[PDB]
Design an enzyme around this catalytic site. Sequence first.
Site, short mmCIF file in Angstrom:
data_model
loop_
_atom_site.label_atom_id
_atom_site.label_comp_id
_atom_site.label_asym_id
_atom_site.label_seq_id
_atom_site.Cartn_x
_atom_site.Cartn_y
_atom_site.Cartn_z
N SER A 171 0.90 -1.12 0.00
CA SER A 171 0.00 0.00 0.00
C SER A 171 0.94 1.17 0.00
N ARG A 172 0.45 2.35 -0.44
CA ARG A 172 1.32 3.46 -0.72
C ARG A 172 0.60 4.68 -0.27
N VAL A 173 -0.55 4.99 -0.92
CA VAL A 173 -1.29 6.19 -0.65
C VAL A 173 -2.34 5.87 0.40
#
Lengths: 265, 120, 116, 116, 48, 290, 361, 73, 239
Positions: free
Chosen positions: F228-230
Amino acid sequence: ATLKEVEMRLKSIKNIEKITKTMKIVASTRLSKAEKAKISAKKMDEAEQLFYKNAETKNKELIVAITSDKGLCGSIHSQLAKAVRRHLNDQPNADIVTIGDKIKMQLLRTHPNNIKLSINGIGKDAPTFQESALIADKLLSVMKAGTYPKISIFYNDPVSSLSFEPSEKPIFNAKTIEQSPSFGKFEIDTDANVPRDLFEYTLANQMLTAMAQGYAAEISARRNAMDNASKNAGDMINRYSILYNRTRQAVITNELVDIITGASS
Amino acid sequence: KLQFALPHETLYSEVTQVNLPAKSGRIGVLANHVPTVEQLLPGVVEVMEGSNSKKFFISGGFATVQPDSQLCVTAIEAPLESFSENIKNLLAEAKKNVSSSREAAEAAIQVEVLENLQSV
Amino acid sequence: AAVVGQEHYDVASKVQETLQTYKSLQDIIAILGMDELSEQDKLTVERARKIQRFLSQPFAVAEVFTGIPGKLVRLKDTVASFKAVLEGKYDNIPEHAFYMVGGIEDVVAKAEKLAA
Amino acid sequence: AAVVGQEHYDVASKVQETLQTYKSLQDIIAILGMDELSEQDKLTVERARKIQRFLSQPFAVAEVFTGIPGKLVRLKDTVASFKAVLEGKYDNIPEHAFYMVGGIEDVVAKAEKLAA
Amino acid sequence: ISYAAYLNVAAQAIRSTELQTASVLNRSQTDAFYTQYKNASEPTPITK
Amino acid sequence: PVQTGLKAVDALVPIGRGQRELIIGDRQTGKTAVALDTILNQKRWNNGSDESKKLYCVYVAVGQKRSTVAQLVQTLEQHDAMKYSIIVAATASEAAPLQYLAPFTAASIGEWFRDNGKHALIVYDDLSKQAVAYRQLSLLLRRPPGREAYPGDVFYLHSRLLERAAKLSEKEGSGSLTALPVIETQGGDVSAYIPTNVISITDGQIFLEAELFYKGIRPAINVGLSVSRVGSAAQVKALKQVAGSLKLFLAQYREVAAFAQSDLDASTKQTLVRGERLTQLLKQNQYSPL
Amino acid sequence: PVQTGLKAVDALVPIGRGQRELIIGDRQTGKTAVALDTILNQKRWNNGSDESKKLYCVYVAVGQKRSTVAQLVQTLEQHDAMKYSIIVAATASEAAPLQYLAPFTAASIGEWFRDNGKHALIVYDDLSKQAVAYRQLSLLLRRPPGREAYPGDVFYLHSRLLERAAKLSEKEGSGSLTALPVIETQGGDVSAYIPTNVISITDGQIFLEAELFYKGIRPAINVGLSVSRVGSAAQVKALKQVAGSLKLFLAQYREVAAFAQSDLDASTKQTLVRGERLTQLLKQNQYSPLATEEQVPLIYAGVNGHLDGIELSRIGEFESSFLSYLKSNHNELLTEIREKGELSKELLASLKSATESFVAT
Amino acid sequence: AINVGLSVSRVGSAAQVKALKQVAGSLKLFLAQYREVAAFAQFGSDLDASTKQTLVRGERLTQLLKQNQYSPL
Amino acid sequence: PPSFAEQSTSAEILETGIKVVDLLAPYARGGKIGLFGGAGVGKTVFIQELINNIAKAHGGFSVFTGVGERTREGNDLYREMKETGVINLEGESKVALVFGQMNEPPGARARVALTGLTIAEYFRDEEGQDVLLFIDNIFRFTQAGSEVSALLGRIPSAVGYQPTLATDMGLLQERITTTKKGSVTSVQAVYVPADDLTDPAPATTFAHLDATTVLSRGISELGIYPAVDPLDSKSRLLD
């Protein structure tokens, strides 16, 4: 192709699997004989040690090390190499007898000069008196072992049937025998040159035993290793199998596309 | 106590009367024998545990009555009968062999062994 | 060549050879071990594992996403850093130290941090 | 069978079996080497190797391809020569003494050339 | 003669009638070489 | 934030509102259950009158047997969760255009909430079955087979579908349709055309751990391959502060437990001891969320 | 049962009459030879008056050149078997409709024998080329070619053809139409669409393999990878009795061949001794059929491990000598095996004694 | 970087310089032995002097073959 | 296929006399439990046992529908079924037989399954009785459907399998469910294409199958009849 090269690589892994399987089992067979020898020998050794303990025998220096000519006995070679090197930091000027090609090579890398005597033909058989006797006789003459009031021999003790810890013991010299406190409580005679015989006798008796322990570890390690190999090969089999299956599907798709293309045009 | 053993066996590794051929001639050990260190010569040995008696031909080794009254006998290879007729023929040849051929000393030991065999 | 420096080109060449060997022996090393290959090869492998880990350099725009603050390493710094590693000078300090960090200096400092 | 001569057939059956084992043994030799290889296996390797280069035969055409004019070997001679090898009458004979040879005279002759 | 040689020869002799099994023969009949080394240097391997 | 009720999906795979983030893994490993757990946790704010943290959740069941859906509904009604949720359905029996049109129609409902500036959520299980449906039509229109015979304008379909999920601005009423698209890997294949197209569009994956799944744990998640990133800036600060790179720590454990076939320094052993124990802590059984 | 005069086929892969069973293997390894051998042992049966024993064989030569088929015809005549034979010929050059319908038309001939209560055997070699011909037809008729550009309803064709082969009931008279389709493989690629289909339809498979060929078994069969799915219900009771053991010894032999190449436990080594001798005994050369009364003794010897003693090279010598010795000692016993068709304990007792005596000399 | 095992010249040494035909006569054979030995060596089998003669010679040959961009000769 | 209401809203375990089945792979009401492990484990006898058990269990009946039947195997089944009295001519016959040989045209091969299903639904709906419908190879169901698609001109989808594979299976396996009245349940035989489960025809099949009972020949060789290998048999109905 993709398909054939995948397939051939998978077959290679298969053959490796088969070989590692074969080896681990055969090694186990051989291992049974290895352990038997070591038992009988250790009982024998104990009778000798019975004297030395009660005697309180009390210890340049010599280094002897033991491995077979043969490899494929795990980290026997390199655990042993490390413990030799540890006592080659204790005295790098120690004259090293490397009984075994494999320990010779690794040890040769850390110091090559210190290697003084070495023996070829070890790995072919389980330790025997004949071998021990000849090595000892030669060891005395060439290396003048009796002069050194410290001899220590390294080998691999097979600590538990799945492990090996490289282990050592000190070979009792004629000097040690002299200054052992109890030796008069045993009736020594002036009618025999017991140091000059006994030194030689326990040079071999200790050596044979050290070898038997090492040998047992060697064949044990080969079995352990060859088993671990088979597991790892199985996993690679699975990985290439999925790739194989995928490549089959893709080929089918491309062939169908060709048919469609032909009809469409 | 008493141990007698080979790196291949455990002969008597208790024994009541032992007759041994040692540097000091022949020595016999019976029950409490004061603790000794005698280098065993290649030997014709009689071992008796009770009145039962077993007879051994021994490669030479070391003998040590411990302070534990454990007569540790260590030797490389022994029974008497296994060592024994083809050996007589062979040894006769080996006596000849000393004539032809360290090797002189070795061949002499082969003759010495022939004397030990002859003693049986 | 010397378009971007013969020395620079030499360092890069060596990285490629080492890595190619390292990738090559991945089959054998896994099925067996690294000990069942030569000591010389083991040095090469150990050096290459370090190089592989060293190549990391946290992103300075995904510094939020990673969580780790980014790292930006100069070209001038790069030539120096890899040169050292190829000679195995810093091949003695943790591969954990090498992992997920930028600069050679940062590796060294993280070795000290790890040691605590 | 006796279509090409019973003897001819039998000789050729023995040759094929010898080669087939050697191909299988390549895998054993690859990892294990001499380990799990009997006296018999070493001989089979050697016989197969001798047979392997016995196939090699010059070509008339060979000038710039080799430069060794072809060898035309009588039918009787070929049957005899393979038989000898298998019997081990030419098992004191090097691998290379079958290399680019023809008939029985040739097998012996190139053996002689290496011999002296 | 050296004591370990003396015992060795004696053991070999003991390996001589009909009772002399293969394992006995192996315990006192083995071939090898001793690849002597020196200071890198290496006096050549000669049969042990 | 979106409170999944799982530490691992809220700090080891953190998320919040508007996010697109697929859930990828092996077929019918209780795949649905992973998503369901999130929906169940959201009852604290979904039975909450706080409308911002109240989601209006749409569960899109495509290619799902009508029987299975009815069991799911009954499960939902046991957890009294059915009431705050809508279900869109396009069963396995149900027609190929209907399956195709099921996500697009569902997103329209989602937009009505979103364009009321409200937070919603939509779970699309499974887009792979939408690919199969679109394939049928296209082929019957004699349109050429795309990659893996899944049409090339399947790409356009998913791309339009996916980007209708997002948190919106103050202008748009601060609304969101938080997606969570659940992609089924046919034969476990993750190199497949349909998954990779989704992965590139979305931010974050929820790759699931099959080996561990076999060795129990409903659910067992391959967090090494989950990303996951954002979603990590859509977090809640409490679980940002306490989550002191525990993902990294447990990918120091991932490394450590990778090698053991091998000497372990006392430091690695301590990491392993924490790591293994942490893994045990992660374990959570379905229908119960923290 | 149907007997091929090959001990391994008759015992290890027991075949009957009516049954359809595959012969998937690589061409020219005497693919045709394996087939021909059966016809010759069937000559024996043919002599036998009953027409369920008169197997009027039909060889369906598909895509085979006339020069080769000329050799076949001559070979059948040589072994005097071309008089109950029928050879349906659709040659390599012969047109694809003829090839396509050649097995179908051939089957209809077979139905006549079956109907008459007689038995016969139709050996389709190779249905792969029948497939290819259909591919030519379909493509030219613009009908879509299936997988591997081979029609998808080639499956449908194969199913229709191969399910006319049947062992009838007394309702339609107990007669039969044994079939043995032959499928030609180029790598043993059972994956290939045409093999997959045929494999499904057939009951049993014979999987003939190259490795064995090189190892001197010519024609060559890998009988580990051969299977029967019609089993020993179509096996002589006698032949079944003295060959259960054989399967198990050989089964162990396969596994223990994977440690054969040194130092081995006595059990493993024992298996190898019996197994190597057995492998040599199971070798066979083209066009040698062998009577059931001589099949039964040979397997018994191996089972009793009587072959173990006689050296591997001397197995060959053993065989002919053993058989003649059995005939001299008691061709009464042999005649009992044939006529009773069952092995009485007294007869096996005597047989065991006989074999021991033969091993002695 | 050339993989010369899958490279052929079917016109032989008639297209080769006469001097170069003589010198590189056994170059192919040495290299062929090097390739075989090198493969074997990676399966970690113990090596005799005859194989290691090949290997040691072979390594020197490998370095001899190498070409660097934009260098004629 | 039935409406949401007349589809299983809660699933219950249809009982069997076999303890092994009721523990290690409990059969579901409406459920499809697809047998794996071919005849050699006594598959046919296992199936026969189930017919008897179903009759005791509910009052049910069965219909053995065989797709892509080998006409030899069909003979064996009929003879065995008569003998073991699941079909007693004089007596009662629980199982109804529909056999569809491979020779029967691909269209009729596809429709044998639906015909079998219609009988079953008459039992469930119009005689109330729960039934258990065996299917043979659903691979050969796939093959038949695939062929008819190509005949219809429809472009073969991946691995050649029909574009309508999902919907057709969808209908077949949603007409097997728990209505208000009975429930059909279907035990199917999956002829995997060389264990290439990755392929759509097995994958889709496994997608439809709720549980799989994986009989092993190893297990039966340890003398265990039931021949079920529970370390292979897996069910979602063990919850």
